[PDB]
Amino acid sequence: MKADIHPTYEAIEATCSCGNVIKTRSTLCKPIHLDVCSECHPFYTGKQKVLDTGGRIDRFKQRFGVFG
Amino acid sequence: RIAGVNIPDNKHTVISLTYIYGVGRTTAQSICAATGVNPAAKIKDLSDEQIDQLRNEVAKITTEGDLRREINMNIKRLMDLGCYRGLRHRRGLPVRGQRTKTNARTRKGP
Amino acid sequence: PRSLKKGPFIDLHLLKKVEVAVEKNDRKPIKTWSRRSMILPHMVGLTIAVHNGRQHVPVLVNEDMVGHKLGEFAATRTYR
Amino acid sequence: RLKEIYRKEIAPKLKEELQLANVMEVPRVTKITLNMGLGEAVGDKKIIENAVADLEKITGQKPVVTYARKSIAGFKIREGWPIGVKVTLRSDRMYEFLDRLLSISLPRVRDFRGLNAKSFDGRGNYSMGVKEQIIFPEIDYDKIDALRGLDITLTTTARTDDEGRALLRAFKFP
RNA sequence: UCCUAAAGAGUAACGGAGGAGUACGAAGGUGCGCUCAGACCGGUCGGAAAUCGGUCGCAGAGUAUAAAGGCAAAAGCGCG
RNA sequence: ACGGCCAGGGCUACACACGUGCUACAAUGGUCGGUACAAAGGGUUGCCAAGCCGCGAGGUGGAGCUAAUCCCAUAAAACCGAUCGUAGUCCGGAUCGCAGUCUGCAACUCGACUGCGUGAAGUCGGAAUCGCUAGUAAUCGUGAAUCAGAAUGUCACGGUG
Ligand SMILES: [Mg+2]
Ligand SMILES: [Mg+2]
Ligand SMILES: [Mg+2]
Ligand SMILES: [Mg+2]
């Protein structure tokens, strides 16, 4: 590694909203918290769900009973 | 990333949340009333503590990346069925029943 | 439109011609000039020959068409 | 440090997982190349330095500007000779930059899926594209210009892409 | 520069085809290091193609300049 | 049958050009919360109050009423305090997706409104061209004729000027 070429590459702390503290070595030179991390994203938490496809049948039965 | 998308600064909370693309003006007022954030203060003056609550509120209505997907799927449901409402939609004519003889220029350009 | 106080709608002749025709399953199209009646979960998969205005055009009823009325699937004007 | 997680957990696990003979046959990540494509604004002579500065901060390493080897008349003339900016990262920087991925750069695609598992080379090299340059530590939003086409190209010591999938799913981000 | 030119040179026609009346202060000298063209897979606004990774390559590229003859001691490419 | 009765469809189609009319493009303004004053008219085959449940359009409810009595019916602009700081924006509302109420045997072609989301063109507009000499032009409301429902046109009178 050349000496006077690269920026300052120091160690900082990445803290998420849930409190997941990650020791990351970056060029930041300061600690900055994050709003979402790998453990809080809906896709990797399993909360992404689906677009629900279509429910007109359901909707019609919820809307109109139509006895008989 | 800030709340799902980048939010402007030097503006009130309700106006700032309007750019979330899925919360308008009235629902933004309800989110602020539920959370407790005062709209009178700028988003700059707010702390980084209740923004998690604002994100939780955003995560219970919709996000734009899925709102556009599902509204496009709703359009597709009409477009793949044979209905007249989609028949005019594909060609780009007015859908709700506006007059087509003249001045249907928003859906056809210059 | 058609508020939930008076929720459903189906013409009497169409209802009696379709509910009875469900017993003897689909071997023919249903020719009906009425376009004001919605289709129902009891009428999924039938063939309806809705009146275009000068002839009857067939309709393939699907499970995703229950909300919409029959007349949406029949043209009025061509503009070829 | 992902190196300590890899040596202790992934390395002994993959040997018995893939029916490998000895310790060192396991696949490993060879290098990470980013290759920020500066094709837009060919005849500018003003965005090359901005792209170099932007890529310098998110990698902790000065990139190298890449010239052309031909001239697509449909694309642009040779007058704008510098078109590309490239970075290479081996183990000292690779495992530390890879911590941003899978830990804090998973909230970086704004996505429904982290990364498609059907995109692999015949030998087992993985590639991925990052749409926005906003997604990184120590980067402003007002001072940054939103014209940055960044890729993340991965190289692995795999004979075939199934070994690449087996290696990737350990530090999984699909 | 090639053919006519007949396996040493040379050899004509108002015979068949092409170029020159220059460029380089580095486009020279030396030391040290590196492969070309082309095909395929993947990679966000590019897409048959730009920049990147990998394999198959085994000079079919390149020569400052027309064609002929050569170029892995590369005669090609970069740095002091 | 160029005469009649019944179903649907059509007159509200749609690269285009024209007349009239309403919205805007904002800071002499946009929202929020207080507070002030009208004229004229319609209502026993009708007006349809209070309480009441609904985010709202509205649903129940049935009073008083045949009219200085009761209802339609809260006039709005202005004025007072806060914020917005001129930014394609707390401007602009078209467009589209979902969800409803009312009328009607019946709201797809093809109705009017209410709730959430989306947010366009538009930064004062060429040749040209029009209305107006005083409660005039300009701007803001109210109620009615046709009417089961349906107005930016149109019926009628008033605020500031
Ligand atoms: Mg010879
Ligand atoms: Mg000879
Ligand atoms: Mg040379
Ligand atoms: Mg009326």
Swiss-Prot record, chain A:
InterPro entries: Ribosomal_bL28/bL31-like_sf, Ribosomal_bL31, Ribosomal_bL31_A, Ribosomal_bL31_sf
Alphabetized PROSITE patterns for the sequence: RIBOSOMAL_L31
Cofactor detail note: Binds 1 zinc ion per subunit.
Keyword Signal: no
Gene Ontology MF, one: metal ion binding
Keywords from the named record: Metal-binding, Ribonucleoprotein, Ribosomal protein, RNA-binding, rRNA-binding, Zinc
Highest taxon listed in the record's lineage: Bacteria
Residues holding Zn(2+): C16, C18, C37, C40
SUPFAM superfamilies in the record: L28p-like (SSF143800)
One GO CC term, this protein: ribosome
Pfam short name (any one): Ribosomal_L31
Requisite cofactors: Zn(2+)
GO biological process, one term: translation
Entry similarity comment: Belongs to the bacterial ribosomal protein bL31 family. Type A subfamily.
Quaternary structure (record): Part of the 50S ribosomal subunit.
Function: Binds the 23S rRNA.
Designated name of the protein: Large ribosomal subunit protein bL31
Curated annotation (Swiss-Prot), chain B:
InterPro entries: Rbsml_uS13_C, Ribosomal_uS13, Ribosomal_uS13-like_H2TH, Ribosomal_uS13_bac-type, Ribosomal_uS13_CS
Positions of the UniProt region annotated as Disordered: 92-110
GO biological process: translation
Record bears the keyword rRNA-binding: yes
Keyword Transferase in annotation: no
One Pfam family named in its UniProt record: Ribosomal_S13
GO MF annotation terms: rRNA binding; structural constituent of ribosome; tRNA binding
Entry's Gene Ontology cellular component terms: cytosol; small ribosomal subunit
Keywords (A to Z) from UniProt: Ribonucleoprotein, Ribosomal protein, RNA-binding, rRNA-binding, tRNA-binding
Matching NCBIfam families: uS13_bact
Subunit structure, as described in the record: Part of the 30S ribosomal subunit. Forms a loose heterodimer with protein S19. Forms two bridges to the 50S subunit in the 70S ribosome.
Family the UniProt entry places it in: Belongs to the universal ribosomal protein uS13 family.
Function comment: Located at the top of the head of the 30S subunit, it contacts several helices of the 16S rRNA. In the 70S ribosome it contacts the 23S rRNA (bridge B1a) and protein L5 of the 50S subunit (bridge B1b), connecting the 2 subunits; these bridges are implicated in subunit movement. Contacts the tRNAs in the A and P-sites.
Designated name of the protein: Small ribosomal subunit protein uS13
Organism, as annotated: Pseudomonas aeruginosa (strain ATCC 15692 / DSM 22644 / CIP 104116 / JCM 14847 / LMG 12228 / 1C / PRS 101 / PAO1)
Gene symbol of the encoding locus: rpsM
UniProtKB/Swiss-Prot annotation, chain C:
Keywords attached to this entry: Ribonucleoprotein, Ribosomal protein, RNA-binding, rRNA-binding
Highest taxon of the lineage: Bacteria
UniProt-listed Gene3D superfamilies: 30s Ribosomal Protein S19, Chain A
Statement: the UniProt record of this protein carries the keyword Aminoacyl-tRNA synthetase: no
InterPro entries: Ribosomal_uS19, Ribosomal_uS19_bac-type, Ribosomal_uS19_CS, Ribosomal_uS19_SF
GO CC aspect terms: cytoplasm; small ribosomal subunit
A GO biological process held by the record: ribosomal small subunit assembly
PANTHER family: RIBOSOMAL PROTEIN S19P FAMILY MEMBER, SMALL RIBOSOMAL SUBUNIT PROTEIN US19M
Chain's role: Protein S19 forms a complex with S13 that binds strongly to the 16S ribosomal RNA.
Family, similarity comment: Belongs to the universal ribosomal protein uS19 family.
Name of the protein in its database record: Small ribosomal subunit protein uS19
Organism in which the protein naturally occurs: Pseudomonas aeruginosa (strain ATCC 15692 / DSM 22644 / CIP 104116 / JCM 14847 / LMG 12228 / 1C / PRS 101 / PAO1)
Curated annotation (Swiss-Prot), chain D:
Alphabetically ordered keywords of this record: Ribonucleoprotein, Ribosomal protein, RNA-binding, rRNA-binding, tRNA-binding
A molecular function (GO) term: rRNA binding
Cited InterPro entries: Ribosomal_uL5, Ribosomal_uL5_bac-type, Ribosomal_uL5_C, Ribosomal_uL5_CS, Ribosomal_uL5_dom_sf, Ribosomal_uL5_N
Pfam families noted in UniProt: Ribosomal_L5, Ribosomal_L5_C
Biological-process GO terms, alphabetical: translation
SUPFAM superfamilies for this protein: RL5-like
GO cellular component: cytosolic large ribosomal subunit
Subunit structure: Part of the 50S ribosomal subunit; part of the 5S rRNA/L5/L18/L25 subcomplex. Contacts the 5S rRNA and the P site tRNA. Forms a bridge to the 30S subunit in the 70S ribosome.
Function: This is one of the proteins that bind and probably mediate the attachment of the 5S RNA into the large ribosomal subunit, where it forms part of the central protuberance. In the 70S ribosome it contacts protein S13 of the 30S subunit (bridge B1b), connecting the 2 subunits; this bridge is implicated in subunit movement. Contacts the P site tRNA; the 5S rRNA and some of its associated proteins might help stabilize positioning of ribosome-bound tRNAs.
Similarity section: Belongs to the universal ribosomal protein uL5 family.
Name under which the protein is recorded: Large ribosomal subunit protein uL5
Species, as recorded: Pseudomonas aeruginosa (strain ATCC 15692 / DSM 22644 / CIP 104116 / JCM 14847 / LMG 12228 / 1C / PRS 101 / PAO1)
Lineage: Bacteria, Pseudomonadati, Pseudomonadota, Gammaproteobacteria, Pseudomonadales
Gene expressing this chain: rplE
